[PDB]
Structure formats: structure tokens, C-alpha cells
Amino acid sequence: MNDSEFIQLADQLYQKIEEKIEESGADVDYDQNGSLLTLEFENHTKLIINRQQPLHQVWLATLENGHHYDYNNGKWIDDRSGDEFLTFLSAAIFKQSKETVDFTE
Ligand SMILES: [Co+2]
């Protein structure tokens, strides 16, 4: 993957996350500030998504941990656990808001 391709795929991801939040009507606020996509819950907790363009990775910070994802099999896959980004993001949103956002279907 080159940088230009990474940008296309990461833009598709960010837009997918935003569209699925809108679709769901969930009370999740989102703000893209360049490389950053911050999700904010009513309880004032956040999830922070960052693009690391030279590594061609998307990173996710939860309250406890950081996760780094490579694009593999048409999906974003955690490079230590092998978990899929969007499934993991759904689970995190449910914990911090008790609202369901399905990003995969
Ligand atoms: Co190419």
C-alpha cells in the first residue's frame, strides 16, 4: 500500500463510522480533526481514532489501551490480537453508552 491508497481506505473507514453513527441515531458525537476522529459519549468519555499515515495504520485508544490496525482481508485487523476494528468498536461503544451501533452490517 502507498500513502495515497491508505488515505482512500482510511477516509472510507472514517466516513463509514460517521455514517453508521448517523444511521443508528445513537447519541454519539463525532469530530474529525484531520487525522483524528474523536467519539464522545453522553457520559463525557471518549474513544480516540487516529491515522498514522507513514505506517499505514489506524489506531484506537480506549479508556485502558491502545490498538493498532493494518488493512487485511478487506478489513482493519488488530496487529497483536487479530480482532476486526469495527466489531471491536461496536463493543466499546456499547460499554460506554449502552447504545448499539453496528458498523459491519
Ligand atoms: Co498501488
Ligand SMILES: [Co+2]
Ligand atoms: Co434506525
Ligand SMILES: [Co+2]
Ligand atoms: Co454534558
